[PDB]
Paper text:
TLR7 recognizes pathogenic single-stranded RNAs (ssRNAs) and plays a crucial role in the innate immune response to viral infections, such as human immunodeficiency virus 1 and influenza virus. The activated TLR7 dimer contains two distinct ligand-binding sites. Small-molecule agonists, including imiquimod, guanosine and 2’,3’-cGMP bind to site 1 in the dimerization interface and directly induce the formation of the activated TLR7 dimer, while uridine-containing ssRNAs bind to site 2 and allosterically enhance the binding affinity of site 1 ligands for TLR73,4. Using cryo-electron microscopy (cryo-EM) combined with X-ray crystallography, we reveal that the structural equilibrium between open and closed conformations that underlies TLR7 antagonism.
We have previously reported a series of 8-oxoadenine derivatives (8-OAs) represented by Cpd-1, Cpd-2, and Cpd-3 as specific TLR7 agonists. We confirmed the binding mode of 8-OAs by crystallography. The potent agonist Cpd-3 induced almost complete dimerization under both neutral and acidic conditions. Three agonists Cpd-1, Cpd-2, and Cpd-3 had higher binding energy in the closed form than the open form. Cpd-1, Cpd-2, Cpd-3 and other known TLR7 agonists induce a closed form structure which activates TLR7.
Author numbering:
A (entry chain A), B (entry chain B): 27 to 435, 459 to 475, 490 to 835
Write the structure that this text describes.
Amino acid sequence: ARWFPKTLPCDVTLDVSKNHVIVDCTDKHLTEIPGGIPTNTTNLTLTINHIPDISPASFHRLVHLVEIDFRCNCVPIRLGSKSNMCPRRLQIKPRSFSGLTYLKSLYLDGNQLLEIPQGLPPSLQLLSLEANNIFSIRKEQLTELANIEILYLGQNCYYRNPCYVSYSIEKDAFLNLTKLKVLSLKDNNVTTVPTVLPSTLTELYLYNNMIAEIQEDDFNNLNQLQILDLSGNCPRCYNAPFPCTPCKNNSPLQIPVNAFDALTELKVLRLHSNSLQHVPPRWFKNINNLQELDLSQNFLAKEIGDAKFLHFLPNLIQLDLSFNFELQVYRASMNLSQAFSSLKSLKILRIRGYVFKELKSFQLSPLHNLQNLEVLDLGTNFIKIANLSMFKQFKRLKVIDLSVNKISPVLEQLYYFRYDKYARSCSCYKYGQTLDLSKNSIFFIKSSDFQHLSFLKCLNLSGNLISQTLNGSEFQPLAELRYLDFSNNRLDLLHSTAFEELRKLEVLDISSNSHYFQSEGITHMLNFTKNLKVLQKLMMNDNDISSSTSRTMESESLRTLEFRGNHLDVLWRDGDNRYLQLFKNLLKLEELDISKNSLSFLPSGVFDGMPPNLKNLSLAKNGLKSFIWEKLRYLKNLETLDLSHNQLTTVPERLSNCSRSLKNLILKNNQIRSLTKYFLQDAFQLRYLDLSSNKIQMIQKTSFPENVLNNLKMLLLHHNRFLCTCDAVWFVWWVQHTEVTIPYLATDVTCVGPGAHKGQSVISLDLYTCEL
Amino acid sequence: ARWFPKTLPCDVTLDVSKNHVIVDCTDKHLTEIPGGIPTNTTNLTLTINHIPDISPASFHRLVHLVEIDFRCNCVPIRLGSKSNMCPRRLQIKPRSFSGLTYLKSLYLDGNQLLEIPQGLPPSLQLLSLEANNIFSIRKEQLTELANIEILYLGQNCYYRNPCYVSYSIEKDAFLNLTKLKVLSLKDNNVTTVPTVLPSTLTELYLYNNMIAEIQEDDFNNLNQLQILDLSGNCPRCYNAPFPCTPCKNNSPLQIPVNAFDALTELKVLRLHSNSLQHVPPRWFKNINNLQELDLSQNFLAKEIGDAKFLHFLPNLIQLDLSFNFELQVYRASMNLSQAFSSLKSLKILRIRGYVFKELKSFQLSPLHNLQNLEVLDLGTNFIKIANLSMFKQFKRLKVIDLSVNKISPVLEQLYYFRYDKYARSCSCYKYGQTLDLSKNSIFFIKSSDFQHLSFLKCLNLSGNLISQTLNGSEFQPLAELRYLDFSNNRLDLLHSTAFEELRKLEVLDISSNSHYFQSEGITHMLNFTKNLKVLQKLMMNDNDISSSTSRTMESESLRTLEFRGNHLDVLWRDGDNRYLQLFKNLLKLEELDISKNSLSFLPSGVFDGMPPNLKNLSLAKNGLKSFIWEKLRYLKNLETLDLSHNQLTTVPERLSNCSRSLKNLILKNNQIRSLTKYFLQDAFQLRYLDLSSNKIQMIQKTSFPENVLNNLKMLLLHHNRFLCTCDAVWFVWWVQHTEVTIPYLATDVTCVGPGAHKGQSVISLDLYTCEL
Ligand SMILES: *[C@@H]1O[C@H](CO)[C@@H](O[C@@H]2O[C@H](CO)[C@@H](O[C@@H]3O[C@H](CO)[C@@H](O)[C@H](O)[C@@H]3O)[C@H](O)[C@H]2NC(C)=O)[C@H](O)[C@H]1NC(C)=O
Ligand SMILES: *[C@@H]1O[C@H](CO)[C@@H](O[C@@H]2O[C@H](CO)[C@@H](O[C@@H]3O[C@H](CO)[C@@H](O)[C@H](O)[C@@H]3O)[C@H](O)[C@H]2NC(C)=O)[C@H](O)[C@H]1NC(C)=O
Ligand SMILES: *[C@@H]1O[C@H](CO)[C@@H](O[C@@H]2O[C@H](CO)[C@@H](O)[C@H](O)[C@H]2NC(C)=O)[C@H](O)[C@H]1NC(C)=O
Ligand SMILES: COCCOc1nc(N)c2[nH]c(=O)n(Cc3cccnc3)c2n1
Ligand SMILES: COCCOc1nc(N)c2[nH]c(=O)n(Cc3cccnc3)c2n1
Ligand SMILES: *[C@@H]1O[C@H](CO)[C@@H](O)[C@H](O)[C@H]1NC(C)=O
Ligand SMILES: *[C@@H]1O[C@H](CO)[C@@H](O)[C@H](O)[C@H]1NC(C)=O
Ligand SMILES: *[C@@H]1O[C@H](CO)[C@@H](O)[C@H](O)[C@H]1NC(C)=O
Ligand SMILES: *[C@@H]1O[C@H](CO)[C@@H](O)[C@H](O)[C@H]1NC(C)=O
Ligand SMILES: *[C@@H]1O[C@H](CO)[C@@H](O)[C@H](O)[C@H]1NC(C)=O
Ligand SMILES: *[C@@H]1O[C@H](CO)[C@@H](O)[C@H](O)[C@H]1NC(C)=O
Ligand SMILES: *[C@@H]1O[C@H](CO)[C@@H](O)[C@H](O)[C@H]1NC(C)=O
Ligand SMILES: *[C@@H]1O[C@H](CO)[C@@H](O)[C@H](O)[C@H]1NC(C)=O
Ligand SMILES: *[C@@H]1O[C@H](CO)[C@@H](O)[C@H](O)[C@H]1NC(C)=O
Ligand SMILES: *[C@@H]1O[C@H](CO)[C@@H](O)[C@H](O)[C@H]1NC(C)=O
Ligand SMILES: *[C@@H]1O[C@H](CO)[C@@H](O)[C@H](O)[C@H]1NC(C)=O
């Protein structure tokens, strides 16, 4: 099927449309650029390898290169592996790039470079040197970069990669770079805005530096600028989870009132962590087009009650005023200026970390006529009291977020508090209007709590204290609710009428409600499913369920059930027939996850008792030691079977004789030592087979007939114990010459023996000695 | 040191005191009795093996045998392994035991025997045949057993091991067994008390059977009987987690009022799950000696309010009235008869599962003058209200257990609800008075809640909802408290004055309080430790701690700190110096557990920052990929180092050069392929080394000097990848001939190669071919 075996340890791809030949050698444990890279190669990635030098030899033949990604072949000591520390900085010999006449992008981040590589081609539009040790920019070193448009110089002098001096930039160093659009000098220990900058800039990044003061003419020429970020100059250092040095005298970043006058094109201004106490209106006099403004992590509590600057921002889309609270203060209420009412275009308003006791309807009144408001985020406020019915005046919003509060009767997990949330390394919103009440102190709920909230489509109660015997009378107003997250509560299923009032509920998550399921001889009515007539998906993961008062769960509607991390091993105790039909009457059930249920065996009757339309079944992570494959005959619509992370030692004698329907078979991380003689014979329906991370030594043609193999979308064999004797000749040949996709042929499909070939990739194996 | 190597795959022991020669071959995957068992052998255990027959060959030479334990060499289908099902019942050929003239004990449980083995010696005092398929007892088959004293016949016909008929016992079958003390017929599908039974019985077990009626003369002769168990005849089957058939018409076990009249010696009567509605006083008329009475899992709610029978039990020590609640009733209060006051000797009273709303002081007044009462257990009652101050009238008690209740302002997990709680397979109490409030609905605490409980030594608040910013004012009355379990709450460490009122606190568990540590940019004062002047032990496991407002924890008292399952990897982010002395000022700290903290490496500064008296350090389960062993020089009092379950690939060149103090080194479950040339040279302090579950191939003499080996209490090498070539000659000899204790030389110290010796124990290896 292939005349010449692909032997290069890099994935290769044609996007013939854009004459792109893409060679990806990301993380292949290489110490040399591999031989025999295609001449027509356009994009070459050599990221995360241990290649110690670049020379004219490196790219000699590859003249059609438009991109070289050579990131992290020597990452700074503190950012990189400590088990494989890079010994010495990447060596770049002269004339290494001057050849590459079509080169448009060059990434040399995280290689401990001391200086900007010279002799670069004039075609270059983008050059990235983040996380090197370049902390002085001279005009002379930048002349090569005439046609440059995007320049990343950040992370060259900061706490993870220290240089122990101030960043230095020569006067007018970037001025003659007349096509420069994006300049990033973030995380560099910079002390003044470099001037003069080319007027051609669209984006300027100066955050996480030691800039104390903005000169009034620092941004005078930048009349094309759209994004400016001055964040984390004079940072607010309270509970900073990085080392943090504030400007002395508790001073803020000092910004002349007329500093932004030139920036008529500005769309995004970021002044996060600048220790601001006031926001002068005068800043925003000649910027009417500002859309995104970040004023998070300042000291603007008082200002939020005033905020005259808001009158000048009628086009603003996003406003962030999060974490402005005064240290040592627990305000009684949120004091929002009337000025908020002048934010005609506002779609998103975030004010986390204001920190106040009580939210009352009136206090949100400035927001009442903001027609386009879509998100209100009042998370992490330690609010103790909130009549949720106030949100009746907010039907128009997509999300009301009261997450992480103390109420009782998306973003990255570390978003506001991480150092560089945009650092490069080496959900129920879609159902409609969402009230996120997660991680609060709600211990008791009743119908009136939700009075006037009929419009809600998703309600997130995850992470509360609800410890109550729901009888179908608690959620009565929520006649439109489609999704309920009840995870991390203490559901008590005394009554099978639980949740039945939610007449349109499509998704119910009662995962991690193990409290009442963890105790012996308490009633649990798992048959509560019957009343929920439109329920598509039920999650009851990690409930530690080992007893049930009802013998059968029933739904005419339910399609997916996650039952992971329970104790079906106890319910199906060998000899106890009573629960072998627990899922049988879930008639439309298509997907069942019963992984992590300690099922070391399956009692007979388990497969017979499965509902008749089951398609996707997980029995992963069960410590299964044995498995009657023949019983798969009962599962007449089975498509996907996940037996990953078990202790199976064998496969069936004939898989076609086990199931006619089975497409996707996952057997990874088992103890399988050898295949049956005619394993896959006549199994024409099979499309995906994972046998990775087993202990297979031989694979003969009888077990792996070609007329089954050649229909496989994918076939995983890596991390086995392959013996490369002459007996293995068919398999070695077949691997080397097959079209079928087999991940990790470079990295992890390898001979353990005999002696001679130990550690050697089978892709590379010369077995001519078997043919003399 | 040893002239003749022990090759036998069984532990062997001399207890010279009791002329015992003890050969334990428990679970050695044997298919034959091994050769070369000592002639002087007295106790031979061959439990859990696959030995398919016994014959006169079996025990030929072993005439001094007093005990043969041969349990579970063929366990019934539903009780045993499904990966290694026993094919065929154990075969006992004639005259197999008749030789063994001193044989006093024979255990043949779980071997699928069809009949009572004949030709047994007349010395036999104990015979166990549990979990075979013997369900008809005939007088003739029992004549061999004249001198028998203890006879276990249970579990031969029940749901896990069915026989599909009634158990049958011939009239007077056991009568001529004139020395019989203990007869167990539990779990046998018995239909009537077998009569007549020898008067010589001390203990009779008939529980879990189909006995519907006791005839009034069924126990007439048994005037030496001490224990009687009739439990689970006519069971209460509500929430039963085994298959359960009740007597028709919900009838009870019917017991003539005079059924116990002969039993003047009875000490323990067990009537668990007999569906009793009334407890006739007349039962206890001629039993003044009764000490333990189990009336759990009946229908005795009403009776508890009356209970005239109690007046006849002034010697009773233990009373169990648990799980007597009426189905579908939630009583308002617990109605305890005054009669309880006549239980002069009572030490333990359990009434779980009465199921009531409100507990008031007066309701316990019958118990007020029970001088010897030590334990009151009112767990699993769904109590919503209890003025804890009522327990001021109970300072004499050791434990007050309100575990698993719904209060707000040891025993097996499956104790009352498992089938046979005495089925054979193949804590802060010691501090003083304990109030267990675990798994309740307490969301808020304040001082007055504990008014008049100054006498408490331990308080268990584990598993509540406490979600509050403890400021030192919540526990003020608990002046004597020594132990607090605050695990599985939601501790908010806003204030470093948390817990400071508990001035005599020696142990504080704040484990699994991860809630407020899981959210970003919240204050956490870990330095709260400073105020607790006598605190010996702090547990703050699984708190998912990745940030702290304080840079140092401090204590002059603290000796043990468990910090397992947190994120020190984030606090010690490479480049962040601020938390490297987090434990330094815990001056008396001797033990630190920082396992499960995702520490793939240890930043420099960590060992320098450890407190000066650290003795016992765990870094287990961290995914450590590297380790600077030299840094152990900073830990000048280190005795135990646990590096188990990591990814270390190398040991130090010389361990003596790394620490002078180190006694116990645990390296198990790592990736170590070889030892350094002089690894253990001059390591005179070393006493315990575990190198098990690594990938070691060779061990040369240089690495393992004899003057270090011969001080080792224990040395673990099992589950490595030992190569048994001629190069391995020293190691093989040394293993075979050393005194040093090396567990699993039989089971798991094994050659992987070469070809010839694959799978072979190194203990057994003959390498004379390397000496010709
Ligand atoms: C960012 O730039 C600043 C300064 O522009 C760097 O701070 C400087 O760092 C060095 C070494 O940390 C300090 O020098 C020291 O002086 C003392 C004498 O008191 C001497 O004992 C030391 O051995 C060393 O020579 C220098 O004073 C300090 N300057 C200031 C104003 O703090 C900083 O390290 C740079 N940041 C990064 C992350 O590279
Ligand atoms: C304990 O003993 C009882 C009675 O001594 C056994 O119950 C009996 O079980 C047998 C076998 O299942 C039943 O006979 C069968 O009847 C069905 C009709 O239902 C027939 O089609 C079968 O071919 C067979 O002949 C019998 O119904 C039943 N008797 C009673 C009174 O329930 C029971 O099996 C024993 N339990 C255990 C765990 O050994
Ligand atoms: C191959 O290299 C080219 C050149 O660096 C990449 O082209 C850029 O793609 C980005 C994002 O997809 C565009 O917005 C830029 O405008 C492109 N620049 C130029 C000059 O062409 C291309 O993405 C690379 N592809 C792969 C798969 O590596
Ligand atoms: C002690 O066991 C009784 C079992 O009944 C049981 N199971 C729950 N999950 C229960 N949850 C619960 O509140 N109760 C109290 C109750 C009991 C009866 C009627 N009404 C309320 C619960 N009782
Ligand atoms: C989001 O920033 C809030 C400051 O940190 C913080 N951390 C807790 N664990 C806190 N827990 C808490 O109740 N608050 C609010 C508060 C503040 C001041 C005085 N009393 C209460 C908390 N505030
Ligand atoms: C709200 O804010 C303004 C300005 O900071 C203040 O003067 C006013 O009194 C505040 N009102 C309340 C109720 O806090
Ligand atoms: C509910 O909130 C939790 C915790 O904040 C979050 O992890 C979960 O995804 C949310 N649920 C949905 C359905 O959005
Ligand atoms: C669930 O099972 C119980 C127990 O028999 C029954 O009373 C109840 O009506 C069932 N509930 C539903 C909603 O099907
Ligand atoms: C050895 O057998 C005797 C008689 O059965 C018994 O009393 C003793 O417990 C046994 N000892 C051990 C430790 O096996
Ligand atoms: C308690 O129960 C007994 C028996 O049911 C009844 O006779 C008695 O009157 C009850 N007493 C109280 C105080 O409820
Ligand atoms: C609880 O009883 C105590 C003393 O036994 C009394 O001081 C107190 O008022 C009672 N408290 C409540 C809340 O019932
Ligand atoms: C407190 O109760 C829990 C379970 O209810 C138990 O695991 C724990 O050990 C108890 N605490 C102590 C200190 O014994
Ligand atoms: C601690 O909290 C209690 C109850 O909320 C309060 O009465 C007390 O004064 C607080 N202590 C301090 C120092 O604020
Ligand atoms: C803990 O740290 C804080 C903040 O530095 C300090 O104010 C507080 O008093 C310290 N507490 C103790 C008990 O040392
Ligand atoms: C060391 O600490 C572990 C962790 O609990 C403990 O189990 C072990 O006994 C300790 N050993 C010594 C000798 O201190
Ligand atoms: C380690 O070895 C060298 C040479 O023996 C010696 O100078 C040094 O003091 C040693 N360190 C310790 C802790 O013994």
